[PDB]
Design a protein around this nucleic acid. Sequence first.
DNA 1: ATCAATATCCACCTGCAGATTCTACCAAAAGTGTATTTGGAAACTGCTCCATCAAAAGGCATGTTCAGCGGAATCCGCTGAACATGCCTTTTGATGGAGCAGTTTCCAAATACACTTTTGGTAGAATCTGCAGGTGGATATTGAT
DNA 2: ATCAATATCCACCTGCAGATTCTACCAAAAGTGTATTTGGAAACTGCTCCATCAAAAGGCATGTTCAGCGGATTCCGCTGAACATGCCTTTTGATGGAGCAGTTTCCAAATACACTTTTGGTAGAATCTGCAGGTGGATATTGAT
Lengths: 106, 106, 98, 98, 79, 83, 96, 93
Amino acid sequence: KTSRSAKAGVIFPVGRMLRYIKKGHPKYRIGVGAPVYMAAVLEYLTAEILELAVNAARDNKKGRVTPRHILLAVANDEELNQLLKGVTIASGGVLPNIHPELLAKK
Amino acid sequence: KTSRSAKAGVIFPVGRMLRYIKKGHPKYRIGVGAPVYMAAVLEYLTAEILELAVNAARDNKKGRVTPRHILLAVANDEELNQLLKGVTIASGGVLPNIHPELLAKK
Amino acid sequence: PHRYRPGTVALREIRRYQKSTELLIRKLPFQRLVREIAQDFKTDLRFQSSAVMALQEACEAYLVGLFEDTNLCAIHAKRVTIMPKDIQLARRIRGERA
Amino acid sequence: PHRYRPGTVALREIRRYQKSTELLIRKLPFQRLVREIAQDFKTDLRFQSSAVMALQEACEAYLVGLFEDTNLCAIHAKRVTIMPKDIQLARRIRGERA
Amino acid sequence: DNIQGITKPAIRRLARRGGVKRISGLIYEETRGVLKVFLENVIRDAVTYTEHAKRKTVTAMDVVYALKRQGRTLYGFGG
Amino acid sequence: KVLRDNIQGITKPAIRRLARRGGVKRISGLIYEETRGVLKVFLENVIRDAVTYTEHAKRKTVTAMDVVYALKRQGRTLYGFGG
Amino acid sequence: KRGRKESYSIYVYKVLKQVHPDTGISSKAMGIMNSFVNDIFERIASEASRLAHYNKRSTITSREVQTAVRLLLPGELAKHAVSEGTKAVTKYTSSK
Amino acid sequence: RKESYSIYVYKVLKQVHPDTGISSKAMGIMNSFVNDIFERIASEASRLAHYNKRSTITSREVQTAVRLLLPGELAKHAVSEGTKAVTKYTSSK
DNA sequence: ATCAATATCCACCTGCAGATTCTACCAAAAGTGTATTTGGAAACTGCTCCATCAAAAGGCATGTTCAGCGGAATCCGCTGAACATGCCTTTTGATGGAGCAGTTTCCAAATACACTTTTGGTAGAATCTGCAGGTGGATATTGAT
DNA sequence: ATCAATATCCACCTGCAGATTCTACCAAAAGTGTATTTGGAAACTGCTCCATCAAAAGGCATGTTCAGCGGATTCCGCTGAACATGCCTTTTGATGGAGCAGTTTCCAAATACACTTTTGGTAGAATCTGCAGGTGGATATTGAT
C-alpha cells in the first residue's frame, strides 16, 4: 500500500487528518482533497517556524531547539507573530527590549 | 395538537429551536431537554433586555422602543454590558459621558 | 460682537453628538471609499444597499470607540488634546498596532 | 563602600529576567493559592500537577503582559515609575475593566 | 482623492461623540490611515466570502461575517 | 491545614521579577497590592471556568485540558500543555 | 414558492407586550433584538456541542446547555437563566 | 496509546537542518501549534461550507479558510503548497 | 583622567538527565464493491442594484484673530532603590496508599428516521398612530463690564 | 454683581412615514409505529495525586540611607477654536434596465457504508550525547576621587 501522504508528496498524515476532520465535523462529507490540502498547509507552516527556530537555536549556539527559540522565532517574524495573537508559549520568555527612556545618564 | 413550546410554558419556538440546533450542530443527537432550555433562556434574556430598554424608552418620554434605548439599556446594566463586549448596536449611539477634566471649570 | 471662549462650543458639540445616533460621515463619499477599496480586491463588484450601511455602521462605531480610548490616553498624559501618539498607544494596547 | 546608583541594578534585572524563562513565582505558595481559590468554589477537588503548572504558566504570562502595557502607559505620561493608575488605564483599554 | 472624502469636519464629529475636546491637527490624516486599514481588513474578508460563495454581490451577511471574525460583532443587519 | 490569605504568597520580590521581565525599571509602592488584586481576579476566573468543565465531566480532578479549555474561553490559548 | 424568511420577531413582540402592552418596538429595534437572540443562540449551542465533544458524548442535552450557559453568562444573569431553563424542561416533562 | 504530530514535526525538523534536535518541551509546543491551527482551519472550513448551504468540506473550503485565517505572505505560500499537493494527489491514481 | 569594585562574557570540563535510536503488538489507514447523494449544469423568474439627470440645502473649505494649552525649565520633597542582615520556608527527593480516572461489558431508555396529518408563521394588504419638526414664549447659560 | 447675546428647554399642533393589525396559502411542527443508538450502571485496574519527612540554602523580610524622580510652579510661544464667508457637492426622489441572485429539476461524479488485508505509529526499552552547573580568569561597565 502507498500512504495518501506519499501520493500527495507530504510528510504530515493525510489519512489521519481526514479522520480528525470527521471526528470533529460529522455531518459534512470530506472531499478526498481537503485532508490533503490541510496536511500540506500545516507542514508548510510548521516548516516555516522550524526554519526560524533552528537558526534561533544556532545563533544561541545550541544544538537542540527549545521553546525560547520558538518564541524568538515567532516573536521576531511579523506574520508568525500575527498568526499567534493570544498564544502563550510556555517556558518561552519574552523578546528582550528595553525602552530608551529607561536607559540612564545623558 | 399541542405545541412543545406550549407544554414548555414558553413563547419562544421550542420546535423551531430544535430544528436550528440540528441544522447548525449536525452530528449530534439532540435530547428534547435542549431546545426547551434554550427557548426558556433566550426568552428570559430577551425579556430581560426589553425590560430595561423600555425603562429607557419611557425615561425618554417616548412610547416606542428604538436601538438608542436598547443600547442605553445595555450600556447601563453591568451584566448585560459584560455579556455584550464586541457587540455594536447599529444606531444605538454611545452613552453620554464627559470626563471631568474636560468640564468647563466652575 | 459675541464670541464664545475656546472649548465652549466643542464641549457643547460633545453633548449634542453623544445624544444623537445618526451617522457622521457623508454617505456618498463613504460609498465611493468602500467600492474603491473593494475594487483593489475583486473587479466589477456589486454591494447590497445595506451591506454599505453595515460597513459605515461598523466603521463609525470603531472610530468612536477608538477616540474614547485615545481621549483616555491624552487625559492620562495630562492633556486634553488628543494627539497621534495617544491613538498609537491606544491601538497598541488594544493589540491592533501597526 | 561601593554602591550602584538607583536604577543601575534595575536595568541589570530587566536584561537578566528578559533573557531567561523560568517561572518567577514560588511554586508552593502558588499551589496553595490555586487550591485556596478552588476550594472556595467546589470542595474536595484534585489537581493534576500539570494543571497547576498550566495555571501558573498562564498567570505569569498574563501579568508580564499587563506590566508591558502598564509600562507603555507610565512612559506615555513621561514617567519611568509605574503606578496603579497606569495598570488601570492599560486594563481599561484592554477591555478588562470589569 | 477618495479617502480625503472623509473630511476633517466629519472626523471631528466622530471624535465629539467619542467625548474628545481638543484635536491636534495631525489627528485627521492619522485617523484617515487607521480607518483605511479597518475598512481594508473587513472588506477583504467580506469579499473572500462573497467570492467563495461564487457571488458578484457583496451581501450584508458577508460584512457581518467579516466583522465577526475581526472580533467586532454587529447587531442590526442580520435580517 | 485551612487555606487563608495565600495571595500574600505573591510576594513583593516576586511581583518585581514579573515586572522586570515586563521591562519595568521603577515601581510605585502601591503596585504590589494593586497587582495581587488583579491577579486574584484573573486566577479566580480561569479556575472558575476550569472547575466548571471538570464538574461537567463529573470528575473530582481538575486536569490540564480543563485549564487549557478555560484559558481559551478567556481568549488566551496556551501551548505546551495540550493532551 | 418564494422566500419565507424566518425570524424571532413575533416572539420578541409577544414577550414585549406581555408586560408592556403600551410600548411599541421599532423596526430597527426589532432587528437588533433579532441579532441578539441569534447571537446568543449560537454561542450556547456552539459551546454546548463543544462540551459534548470533550466528554466524548454523542448527544447534546439540557445538561450541556446548562453548563454552556454557566460558562457564557455573567453572575446573576446566568443564575436566573438556569432557573428559567431548568424550570422549563421541568414543565415540558411533568406533562409530556 | 496516544497520537501526536511529533514524528512528522521531527521529520520536517530534519529537513531544515540535519544536525539540530528538539527538546520534548519544544516538541510539546510544535504540537500545540499544529493542533491549534488544524482546528482553526477546519472550523472556518465548515463555518464556510455551511454559510453556503453545502454538505461537503472540500479543498476549496479548506483553501478559502486558509485565506481568511493566515497573514498575507504565509497565506500565499500556504495556498500554493496545498494547491500543489492536491494536484499531485489528483493524479497519484 | 584614573583606578578600585563588581558584574559580565567566555573558553574548558564532564557526568547524567533527558533526547535519540531501537524492537515488535495493534489501532488504523489503504484496497474493493456497491448504495446513497451531493452540487454543478441547464433553465428561468424577478428582487434590487446601478447609471444618468437635475436641482436647492446643507455642508465644507478657508482665512482671519487670539485664547489658553502644551511643553520647557527650575526646584525640592520624599518616596522608591540599593544593600547588608538574619533566618525561615520553599525546594528537592524517595516512600506509601488509595482515591479515582479510564476501560470494559451490557440492558433500556432516549433519539432517529420514514412518513402522514394539523396549524402556527410569514407575506402582502388593510387600518392605524407615535413622534418628528415647526412655532414660540420663557428660562438658562455664557461672557463682558 | 449686572446687562445681554445665544442657546436650550417645554408646551402644543398635526400629517404621515412607519408601526400595527389582518386575510388567508403552506412549509414546517406535532403525531405514530418502528429501527438504531447511547451513555449510565457496575465490577475492575493501575496511574498519579496527596501527604510525609528531613535537610538547607535560596530567597524573603526588615531597616537604614539617600539619590533622583515626580510633580508643583512659573512662563511664553503658538497651535488649534471660534466665527464670518464664499460656494462645491452631497442629498433627495424618480427610474427602467439588466445584472444577477434564489428556485427548481435532473444526473454523472464523488463521499459514504461495510469488510478485509496490510503496515506506519506508538509505548517500552536499550542506547547515546547536548548541555547544566561549577571553576577560573580575563574584560567591560560603574562610580568615586
